[PDB]
Each structure stands twice: as C-alpha cells, then as structure tokens.
Amino acid sequence: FRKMAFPSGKVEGCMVQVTCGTTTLNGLWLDDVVYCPRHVICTSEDMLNPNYEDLLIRKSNHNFLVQAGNVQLRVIGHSMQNCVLKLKVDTANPKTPKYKFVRIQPGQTFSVLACYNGSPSGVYQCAMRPNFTIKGSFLNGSCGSVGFNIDYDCVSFCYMHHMELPTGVHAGTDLEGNFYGPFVDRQTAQAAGTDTTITVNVLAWLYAAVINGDRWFLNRFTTTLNDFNLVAMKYNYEPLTQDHVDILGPLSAQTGIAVLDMCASLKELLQNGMNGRTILGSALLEDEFTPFDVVRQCS
Amino acid sequence: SGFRKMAFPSGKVEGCMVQVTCGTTTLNGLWLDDVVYCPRHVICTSEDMLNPNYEDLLIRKSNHNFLVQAGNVQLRVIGHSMQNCVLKLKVDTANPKTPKYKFVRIQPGQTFSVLACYNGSPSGVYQCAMRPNFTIKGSFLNGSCGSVGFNIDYDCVSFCYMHHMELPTGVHAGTDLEGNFYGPFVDRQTAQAAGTDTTITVNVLAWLYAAVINGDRWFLNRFTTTLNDFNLVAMKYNYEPLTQDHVDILGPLSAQTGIAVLDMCASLKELLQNGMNGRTILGSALLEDEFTPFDVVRQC
Fold it and tell me: Chain A closest CA to B190's CA: distance in Å?
C-alpha cells in the first residue's frame, strides 16, 4: 500500500518558462493564456511593500519572455486576477487537455508536478493541511508549480505554488488566484497555524488496513461523537462531523465496522499508543489518504 | 526541513503502454519501436500456472492469437519470439511516441519510478527502491502485470523493471527488460519464499549526511568506530553490512561536511540503540533507506 500520484503526462505539455527582468518561474499554458504568480513582475526590492496595480501599468508586453521548450511565445496582452497573471499569447497550446478550475477544501488530496525553470522534474501526492499549507519538496525556482486531480478525461487544476514559508511548508492559490489561508504575496514575516491531523483521513486509512487483513486494533467497544472529539482535540485531531460519518459510509457497510465502532479503536491508539505494533507496516498513523483515495486504490 | 519522496514524470512512458490480450488473459505491454514487450505468462491459463511448459504453449500459438490494443487503434501482430521470461511481439507500425530509451539492470538499493497500469491504462505513479531480497514493496492489484519501472536522465528513459508476480506476502517480483528475473524467483504458481528484508545501510547514511547539510545535528556524537565493529552491531538490527565500496561512494558527502563515514556509522549505531525519543530527522519520524547517495549528492 503506497501513496500514488496521478500520471503527469497531460500536465507536462502545458508547463512553460516565464521571465520578467531577472525573475524566472513556471507558467501554466492553456489555450492562448499563460498563468503564473503575479510576483514575477517584482524585483527583490519591490517585494517589501509592492503596489502590483502600479507596477503592472508600467510594464509592457515585450517585458515578458515566455518559452515553451525552444519555441518562443509572443505576448500580445496581459491581465491580473487576484494574484495570478494572465498573459495572452499568439499561439494556442495544441496539447491543451480537457481542464477545469476547482477550489478544494483542507484535507483533500492532489498531485503536484514540481518544475524548475519551466521543466518538470518530479511528481508527488500530498494533502492540503488544515492550516492551508502543503508539506512538499520545492526548491528555489519551483514557483508556479501546479497541483491537479485527474478524472476519466478531465484534469482539474486546483493549486499553484506561490511562496515557501520558513518552516519548510509552502503556500499558494487556486488557478483563479484566491490564496489558500491567511497569506499575502509579500516578502514579510508570515506564520502558519498549528497543523492538526485530519481525523477523517486516518479513519479511511484504518479501513484500508482492515481490507488488507490487518485487524489487530479492532475492539468490542464503540463510542460517541462528543466523547471522541473531546479526546481528539486533546491530542490535536480535527473534530469529526456527521458529514464525515456519511462519507465513510461505503467503507463501513463493506467491512461491517461502524464509524463510531472504528472511532473507539482510534481512541485507544492515541491514549495507549501502538504497544510496539505496526499498522500497514507503519508505526505512524497516516492522514494523507482521503476516503475516495482508499476506494479507488483498494478497488 | 522536508525531503519528500518524488517520482519521475510519467509523460514519456504513458505513450508506450498498450493492452495485450491472449485467450482470456489480459495484461499490460510496453510498446517501443515496432516491438511489444509483455510477460510470457499471458499464453497461460489458470491451470497452466502450476507447471507451465512455455515452449509447448508458444509453438501452438499464431500471430492472430495475440490482440494488441493502443487505446482505440488495434495493432496487428506480424511476428513473435520469446527471450527468457518476456514475450516480444513484432507489430506492423512503430510507435510514433517512442522516446530515447535504454535497457539497464539495477542492483538492490537502487531506486526507480513505477507506472502502474490496468488493461493498458495508467492509473498512478510512485517512487520505490529494489529491496535486498530482490522484491519491491508497491501497490499492485490484479491486471497490473506488465507495469514498468524507469529512471529519467536528461531526456533518456532507462527501463529497468517489469512486474510479473505478486507473491504471498504482498511484495512483488519481476524481471529486467531482457527477461532475466530479479532474484531467485520463477514465473510459476509455486510456493516461493522471499528472503528477510533488511534495511539498506548505505541509503540511510546518505540520508543522514543530507540532514546535517540541512542543519540537523542532534544525533551526532563524538565517537568513531571500525567497519568490522559496525557490521557486528548492524547485523543485530537486520541492517545490510557496509563494504569498502560504500565508503568511497559517501566520500563527497563526507568531504562537503567534516564528518567521516566511520564517524557517521557510530552516530547511526547510537540511533539504533536509543531511538528517536519523539524527535524527527528532516521531518521524518523514521529512518529513510530509499534515497540513493546519487540522489543526495545531486541537489544536495
């Protein structure tokens, strides 16, 4: 049981390199528009207190270099939408897939195509943490890297990398540019909130262990929503909701283990630890598998 | 901090995956130039798997018995030959999306990406390492046979693995692209026992060398040790013995830092006897052994 990322083929053909002055990051080329973070127009000194609306008026079309491999794209127009630059080019991207712009909630998972100077180099699966950050492996030059999910034929773009926090986590926006979390695209002191554990994802991971025949943590007891949440907050766990129980419904009916029955098993694993035991080969409780991921992966 | 396990982009490999059907058996195939590679346990039925006679089975087959499907386009088989444990299906049309590719055989401890497919359709990609018992710990359900493993260097793709068997313990076995098995395994439905899976010692040391470059030093100690004494202790924890070849490979990592290799071995020995005590190394609560020294030296 591994953490699998989506195939990156449909997204690789869209990545481009955007240069404005001495700043170079990654862009998203779809149709005749290239999307990239708006701080590409800022020098190292403008980032302290940038007036993007004033900075964008001074810039012109010839100030942007857009490169798709060795082909060079020509900018005929520029526009801004909530921290995301939209550059209109003269040639439409012939490798444009069926795509959609969606905004995800914390706790949901997606795949990230890490790029460097408009060149894809790696892909990994991650989850939006409750503090609206992602624990990824980005290095200087990976700005503009996108996150996505894949349907049968449709690619859903849901994330674009903007900043790296000093703690090592990264913050970004959606493709319409709305930031995830209380962050601003400025070079200042910003802090991410306390990162809590996604309880609904842990339960779905425990169900996957029962599917894989690892069922030593099951007990004869059940519990209540309010009793569990009081313990959950003590150990920094996201409170469970009625909606969470209904999302886990299919896994409960399949295994015969009710959500509140499994909650009593999770309630034991926190107070008393794992007693020198492992689940799915791990001594740690994974929380980056959504219930939908378990259904797809196990079936 | 933060050292995520990244896999290579799968775009160049997605265009080479096809679906091969023989009788009632369907698995994945690799389409390079005008040749299709797939496991030879596709001319077998369920009963043939106990004691298959592949020479007897293949002589009774014709070109039209093999159905090769690349999405909607059906490929016509014009020839077939068997090399070791892999079937080579010659087709009329060469793959127009054939990338610059090579065939290499890897050693245990080396890492690669896996593109899992089901009936010629990819569904996920993950990064893994070849275990010392010549098995891989991935997620392969039925129909994933024929999935390939690869590394990408510059613009050249290196195919190094093809999935064949699932094995009772849940860890899968396969061959290289020349049909030679990794390990003592065979393509029979017999009781096959994998060896004890040990931790790759050289990968951990390279991972620990990257930690001190990133600013983690809490596990360092002032003691040093000999190679013979370390392997005596490491054997007790089911750790792979360290060789002189491993010492030289870690040389540049021990040159950028002041820590000698044997100096780091003593620190690793202290970690095994104590534990983590609730602390982390590069954001990981456990010791990572799936990062090769090459992957650490580059992008250090």
Answer: 22
How far, in Å, CA of A233 to CA of A228, rounded?
Answer: 9
Q: Is B18 helix (H, G, I), strand (E, B) or coil?
A: strand
Count CB pairs under 8 A between chains A and B: 84
What dihedral do alpha carbons A28, A33, A35, A38 form, nearest 10°? 150
Amino acid type, A272 = N
**CA-based R_g, chain B, Å:** 22
Q: Among residues A14, A20, A36, A39, which one is catalytic?
A: A39
Residues of chain A with Cβ-Cβ distance to B286 below 8 Å are 283-284
From B1's Cα to the closest Cα of chain A, the distance in A is: 5
Q: For residue A140, give the chain B residue with the closest CA.
A: B299
Return the percent helix, strand and coil in chain A, to nearest 5. Answer: 25, 30, 45
Report DSSP letters for A235-266, one per residue: TTBPPP-HHHHHHTHHHHHHHT--HHHHHHHH
In units of Å, what resolution does this entry have?
2.2
Select from B4, B137, B170 the Cβ nearest to the Cβ of A137. B4
Residue B290 in contact with residue B111, Cβ under 8 Å? yes
**Which technique?**
X-ray
Calculated CA dihedral for residues A160, A161, A163, A166, nearest 10 degrees: 130
Which of left, alpha, beta for A222 (phi over 0: left; psi -120 to 50: alpha)?
beta
Contacts of B5 in chain A (CB under 8 A): 124
CB–CB of B6 and A168 under 8 A?
no
What does DSSP say about strands A120-127 and A154-164: parallel, antiparallel, or unpaired?
unpaired
How many C-beta atoms lie closer than 10 Å to residue A196's C-beta? 18
Show the tokens assigned to B120.
């010629």
Q: What is the CATH number of the domain that holds A71?
A: 2.40.10.10
A4, A137, A169: residue with CB nearest B116: A4
- Whether A222 contacts A252, CB under 8 Å: no
Take residue A194 and report the two structure tokens written for it. 């306390």
What does the alpha-carbon distance between residue A68 and residue A75 come to, in Å, rounded to a whole number? 13
Specify the CATH number for the domain of residue A274. Answer: 1.10.1840.10
User: 3-state DSSP call for residue A17?
Assistant: strand
Domain that holds residue A270: 199-298
**Residues on chain B bordering chain A, Cβ-to-Cβ distance under 8 angstroms:** 1-11, 14-15, 115-116, 122-126, 128, 137-139, 170, 283, 285-286, 299
- Which stretch of DSSP H or E encloses residue A157? strand A154-164
Q: Which residue from B6, B123, B285 is facing A124, i.e. has the nearest CB?
A: B6
Q: Is A39 a catalytic residue?
A: yes
